[PDB]
Ligand SMILES: COc1ccc(S(=O)(=O)N2CCCSC(C)(C)[C@H]2C(=O)NO)cc1
Ligand SMILES: [Ca+2]
Ligand SMILES: [Ca+2]
């Protein structure tokens with residue numbers, strides 16, 4: 001694994017997230033599940049717990065966007081940059097933006113929202129890219145992984161616990 005520079009990490013175990021908008025590519029219900037499951041992944045190996053807001057500024061603001069969308073890094077159309085996110089911190093920090101010029105699916109017939117969400121949310125949590133090929137934090141986008149056999153890799157578990165520790169009990 002690999003954390004960020006100056007090793008940013010939230011100074012609190014409980015984080016709030018908010019889904020700011022919805023992609024026309026999937027039923028609102030599928031977008032919710034992906035985010036909740038992307039969150040389960042990390043929540044299971046650390047003291048981190050999460051809750052949802054429907055208003056106010058949440059730590060982890062999630063949203064879909066196209067091209068220019070409010071920051072300095074406009075999205076680039078279909079493919080290539082799938083989504084980007086920010087390290088822990090105030091305001092735009094911790095937020096995750098998804099490119100809608102991608103076709104977000106619940107399976108692998110395009111860009112799986114879960115798989116890509118878990119990885120972006122690790123960013124919000126403070127993890128940078130991993131050199132480990134079998135790691136979820138690898139800049140790894142592969143459409144050949146059954147969803148069925150997915151499991152966070154020891155590399156991912158190592159790096160996030162480096163920051164927050166193992167589960168309390
Ligand atoms: C499994 O999770 C993911 C999430 C994003 C990408 S990506 O294709 O958008 N991307 C890899 C390819 C270069 S661009 C990037 C730096 C913005 C980077 C990425 O990991 N965003 O955090 C790939 C796999
Ligand atoms: Ca934020
Ligand atoms: Ca793109």
Ligand SMILES: [Ca+2]
Nearest residue numbers: 025100101102
């Ligand atoms: Ca789309």
Ligand SMILES: [Zn+2]
Nearest residue numbers: 069071073097
């Ligand atoms: Zn953005």
Ligand SMILES: [Zn+2]
Nearest residue numbers: 119120123139
């Ligand atoms: Zn990434």
